């Protein structure tokens, strides 16, 4: 019965060049455990800028962000330990094998990587048995799969998605979406989407639409 | 550590060029320190096997002692008690069968000769084993040194003075060989020198006794010279060649600091890929090296022992990770949002 | 009431890892001077894929592109003299400046690059006098700009545009897609403009939804 | 070379450090080819300056000849006709005031010196002036030369044999100064060989006339194999470093090609920037290279002419070329697919 995440009136400035733009603006958001919650709006409106303060890959100008079981911890500790990554772009690295990719998760945090647990994960994004393809052997959506599961090997308990269906055609990105709910209901996640395809609001259980920077 | 071994596996292809630069350079720096110490000791192996502690020489005009130029007087070996004459002199030798030039040192008789040489001086002269068997010569043969008739007194092993062997003399016959009324050319100490020197007597330790050979000390400090631009183009090479290479990583990089890599992490893994592919480079040049030079050892003077192949190896791969850390130094800079793109 | 350009029945497979993919199934567009035609659709439907053909990026696995007043050519020169591209990201080489970055379309074009005309036209784009900025000085909507004025040096027929507004907040997401269409008709270019903001499609003469790879025609 | 150029002005720094790997290495070796060319007149000039044709040497156990185990006796020397007697030692020189080792050179009495030294060989000794400075030693002093004390007979220019110079005497004083009943060493020919030698016999070139100098074929040798790896080195520095250069502009590229840029433009651009990279390392590298030689050249020798100082520079510019097509060859392989996407 406590949020994950809480953004209370964060803002965010960026030198834009010469000058200065304000990207976010006064944003409020918060999340409970087992919530899909979606930022809708047009590309430039403040998306993925809400999305990197969420990942504390950038402190806001103003306002606090506070990921309760992370007080008390550096920006990059706190990525580590708590959060997952969907990135926009698979971001898969090229010399690592679809299991190897989870496993680098666990090296970096410092723990024996874990070859069974790699499969199972795997298998539950429907890649049962595809642990040993290289990043040759992957379509589209089965590196967006291999994306998802290493988000989901340290076990984070905030999941954030950087409109991952972006280059997948309208049948692959409804199983990401579906995948994506379903596991932030069976490991009770507190994940964060960004997309631009409405059809896909549907399976999230609230949604937050932004303009400019402000949230509504 | 994790990225950086696989990604030598994926990419052996890029690595081999580098780390075959790196070997070339390991090989060349391994067989220019055999070449240099092998030549300082076709220079230098007799004296130091003779190993004095201090060394008197006699000078004209006040210049540089120079051991082509100086004369020990029999007046100066009566001055300085507690050291002997050696007489140092090059010249033809002749036999019925084959001739050459030979380096003849001339000491007391009686002196023993290092263990290095063994033997003793013996009355005629000692000559070395490879120098009698080229002149067909035996022990008892009589031989033509320097103009002068003298009895081959027995084999020796060889020691070298100025890229020739050394031939052992007794004082007396060194002086009809080499046509001098001096005792000898230089005054060996063994102990301590307890008197001080004349205007024209210098005392010089036994490096400084080196640097009184005509060709040894600007010889070899021209190859000195030559092996340090060798260890620091190796370092430019690598610290060229791995600025390059980890920009070409950030962007694996920043997938991995996004994730929540700490800074340690990324910089050990990208330092741990230098090292390995340093290692190998050093490791195919040093052993490539060692083999052609005990191959060639035979031909040209190579001096090969553990220190002279893996002490510049070392040095080598040190020096690619002072280099490497330098190169490296970037990849905590490196923000994560690059990731974001 | 002659095209530029016409894609006819054409589709595109790319090799999706293992399998292949009919990225592109059958798109019929024409496109004539003075029209700006919008392509919408949801990200991943087939804009980019039919725009890439456009472009002559790359060839179809079957059916047919053509260009006027360019037949009979490969693939690479019918880019350089008859195509500009606003592509999705400003695409701006680090080491030149604003000006150069038109400049150097003209000298890989073969002709002394003219500073003149490389003036007037940053001027049209409203960056007059900041031809000597670098990128590291330049704003979004400022790079986009430059990408727009970089695509008319040519005087091209075909103008492309990949979600030339992706980065850019509603203010100048307008600006540009104005520009587009004011320089689209002051220079009777025949511009395809991929986009998935349905609110420009007002700026637009014609539009072509997309689904899955095929044109709603 | 409109984007190569550009690109060099406005990051100078990462281009500098591989530049100046380029021109250290040319810098060693052009101080390396300087070297080993003058100690090559360090060990022959002095020979080369007589100029023969053929050089007749005598060996025994019919050996490689050398110039330290070789005599003529007279009559074999009357066997070959038209033929000059060359006696060849080294010994030391005494005068009052000071001594040391040089070379002495000896020749048939009245015969004149080739034109590269001049003057003719007169009874007694022909000092290099050099050598009679140091030794302090005017025309009509004694100096004793090998254990015998002669006049010299005046003073000539300075020739070189084994790292020492050549003091040139008559062929009898020559004798006495070398305890030898022979008439020289070796027989220096300046007309075509018309006489056939005995099996301890052995006519060579003036090429391989110098292989019997113990020190010139082993060291020069040596310094031509150190210097056949530099310029190997050199090769593979461009190419290892090159590849991983080009493959850093891929998106720079694809970008160009994009816009319809021609495979030769892209290729021609990238190779104009390598060349323009080279030719910089390479021209600073040998400027300074020349300019330390020419201030060591006084106390190490040094022989520095301009085909000593270029011709390497040269060789090396045009393997940093074959080289960096060979690294280029992937600029015409990349797709403009690339410009579209991330
Ligand atoms: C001015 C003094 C000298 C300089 C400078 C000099 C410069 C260099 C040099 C520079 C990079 C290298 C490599 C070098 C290497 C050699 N060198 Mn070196 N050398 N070097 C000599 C004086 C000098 N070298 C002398 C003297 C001999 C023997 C002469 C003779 O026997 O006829 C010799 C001979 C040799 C030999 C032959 C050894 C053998 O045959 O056993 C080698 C190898
Ligand atoms: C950059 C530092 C490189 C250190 C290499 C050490 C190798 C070494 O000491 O081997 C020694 C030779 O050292 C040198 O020639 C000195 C070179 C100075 C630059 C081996 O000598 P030795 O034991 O055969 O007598």
Same mark, same amino acid.
């Given at each position: 019965?406590?949020?994950?995440?809480?953004?209370?009136?964060?803002?965010?400035?960026?030198?834009?060049?010469?000058?200065?733009?304000?990207?976010?603006?006064?944003?409020?958001?918060?999340?409970?455990?087992?919530?899909?919650?979606?930022?809708?709006?047009?590309?430039?409106?403040?998306?993925?800028?809400?999305?990197?303060?969420?990942?504390?890959?950038?402190?806001?100008?103003?306002?606090?962000?506070?990921?309760?079981?992370?007080?008390?911890?550096?920006?990059?500790?706190?990525?580590?330990?708590?959060?997952?990554?969907?990135?926009?772009?698979?971001?898969?690295?090229?010399?690592?094998?679809?299991?190897?990719?989870?496993?680098?998760?666990?090296?970096?945090?410092?723990?024996?990587?874990?070859?069974?647990?790699?499969?199972?994960?795997?298998?539950?994004?429907?890649?049962?048995?595809?642990?040993?393809?290289?990043?040759?052997?992957?379509?589209?959506?089965?590196?967006?799969?291999?994306?998802?599961?290493?988000?989901?090997?340290?076990?984070?308990?905030?999941?954030?998605?950087?409109?991952?269906?972006?280059?997948?055609?309208?049948?692959?990105?409804?199983?990401?979406?579906?995948?994506?709910?379903?596991?932030?209901?069976?490991?009770?996640?507190?994940?964060?989407?960004?997309?631009?395809?409405?059809?896909?609001?549907?399976?999230?259980?609230?949604?937050?639409?932004?303009?400019?920077?402000?949230?509504? | 550590?994790?990225?950086?071994?696989?990604?030598?596996?994926?990419?052996?292809?890029?690595?081999? /060029?580098?780390? $075959? %630069?790196? =070997?070339? *350079?390991?090989?060349?720096?391994?067989?220019?320190?055999? #070449?240099?110490?092998? &030549?300082?000791?076709?220079?230098?192996?007799?004296?130091?096997?003779?190993?004095?502690?201090?060394?008197?020489?006699?000078?004209?005009?006040?210049?540089?002692?120079?051991?082509?130029?100086?004369?020990?007087?029999?007046?100066?070996?009566?001055?300085?008690?507690?050291?002997?004459?050696?007489?140092?002199?090059?010249?033809?030798?002749?036999?019925?069968?084959?001739?050459?030039?030979?380096?003849?040192?001339?000491?007391?008789?009686?002196?023993? /000769?290092?263990? $290095? %040489?063994? =033997?003793? *001086?013996?009355?005629?002269?000692?000559?070395?084993?490879? #120098?009698?068997?080229? &002149?067909?010569?035996?022990?008892?043969?009589?031989?033509?040194?320097?103009?002068?008739?003298?009895?081959?007194?027995?084999?020796?092993?060889?020691?070298?003075?100025?890229?020739?062997?050394?031939?052992?003399?007794?004082?007396?016959?060194?002086?009809?060989?080499?046509?001098?009324?001096?005792?000898?050319?230089?005054?060996?100490?063994?102990?301590?020198?307890?008197?001080?020197?004349?205007?024209?007597?210098?005392?010089?330790?036994?490096?400084?006794?080196?640097?009184?050979?005509?060709?040894?000390?600007?010889?070899?400090?021209?190859?000195?010279?030559?092996?340090?631009?060798?260890?620091?183009?190796?370092?430019?090479?690598?610290?060229?060649?791995?600025?390059?290479?980890?920009?070409?990583?950030?962007?694996?990089?920043?997938?991995?600091?996004?994730?929540?890599?700490?800074?340690?992490?990324?910089?050990?893994?990208?330092?741990?890929?230098?090292?390995?592919?340093?290692?190998?480079?050093?490791?195919?040049?040093?052993?490539?090296?060692?083999?052609?030079?005990?191959?060639?050892?035979?031909?040209?003077?190579?001096?090969?022992?553990?220190?002279?192949?893996?002490?510049?190896?070392?040095?080598?791969?040190?020096?690619?990770?002072?280099?490497?850390?330098?190169?490296?130094?970037?990849?905590?800079?490196?923000?994560?949002?690059?990731?974001?793109?």
């Amino acid at each position: 019965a406590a949020p994950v995440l809480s953004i209370t009136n964060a803002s965010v400035v960026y030198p834009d060049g010469i000058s200065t733009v304000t990207a976010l603006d006064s944003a409020n958001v918060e999340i409970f455990p087992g919530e899909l919650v979606a930022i809708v709006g047009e590309s430039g409106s403040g998306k993925s800028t809400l999305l990197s303060i969420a990942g504390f890959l950038q402190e806001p100008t103003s306002g606090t962000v506070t990921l309760h079981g992370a007080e008390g911890l550096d920006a990059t500790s706190t990525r580590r330990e708590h959060i997952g990554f969907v990135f926009q772009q698979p971001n898969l690295l090229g010399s690592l094998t679809a299991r190897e990719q989870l496993l680098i998760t666990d090296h970096l945090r410092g723990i024996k990587p874990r070859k069974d647990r790699a499969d199972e994960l795997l298998a539950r994004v429907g890649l049962k048995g595809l642990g040993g393809r290289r990043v040759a052997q992957l379509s589209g959506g089965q590196r967006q799969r291999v994306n998802i599961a290493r988000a989901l090997m340290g076990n984070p308990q905030l999941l954030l998605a950087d409109e991952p269906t972006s280059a997948l055609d309208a049948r692959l990105s409804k199983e990401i979406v579906e995948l994506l709910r379903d596991v932030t209901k069976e490991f009770a996640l507190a994940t964060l989407m960004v997309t631009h395809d409405r059809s896909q609001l549907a399976y999230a259980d609230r949604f937050v639409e932004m303009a400019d920077g402000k949230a509504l | 550590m994790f990225l950086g071994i696989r990604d030598i596996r994926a990419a052996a292809g890029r690595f081999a /060029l580098i780390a $075959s %630069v790196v =070997g070339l *350079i390991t090989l060349l720096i391994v067989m220019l320190t055999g #070449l240099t110490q092998g &030549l300082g000791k076709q220079n230098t192996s007799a004296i130091e096997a003779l190993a004095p502690h201090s060394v008197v020489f006699t000078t004209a005009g006040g210049s540089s002692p120079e051991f082509t130029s100086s004369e020990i007087s029999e007046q100066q070996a009566e001055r300085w008690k507690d050291s002997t004459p050696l007489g140092v002199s090059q010249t033809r030798i002749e036999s019925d069968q084959n001739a050459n030039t030979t380096a003849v040192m001339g000491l007391p008789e009686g002196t023993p /000769l290092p263990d $290095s %040489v063994g =033997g003793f *001086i013996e009355q005629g002269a000692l000559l070395p084993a490879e #120098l009698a068997d080229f &002149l067909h010569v035996r022990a008892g043969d009589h031989i033509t040194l320097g103009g002068a008739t003298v009895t081959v007194a027995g084999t020796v092993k060889t020691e070298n003075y100025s890229h020739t062997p050394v031939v052992w003399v007794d004082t007396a016959t060194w002086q009809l060989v080499s046509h001098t009324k001096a005792v000898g050319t230089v005054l060996l100490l063994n102990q301590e020198p307890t008197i001080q020197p004349q205007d024209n007597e210098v005392v010089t330790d036994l490096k400084g006794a080196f640097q009184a050979m005509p060709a040894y000390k600007s010889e070899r400090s021209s190859l000195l010279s030559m092996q340090a631009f060798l260890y620091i183009i190796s370092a430019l090479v690598t610290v060229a060649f791995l600025t390059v290479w980890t920009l070409q990583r950030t962007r694996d990089i920043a997938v991995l600091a996004a994730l929540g890599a700490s800074k340690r992490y990324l910089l050990i893994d990208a330092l741990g890929q230098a090292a390995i592919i340093l290692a190998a480079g050093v490791a195919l040049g040093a052993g490539i090296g060692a083999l052609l030079g005990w191959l060639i050892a035979g031909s040209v003077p190579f001096s090969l022992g553990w220190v002279s192949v893996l002490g510049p190896a070392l040095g080598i791969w040190l020096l690619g990770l002072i280099g490497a850390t330098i190169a490296v130094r970037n990849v905590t800079k490196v923000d994560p949002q690059i990731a974001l793109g």
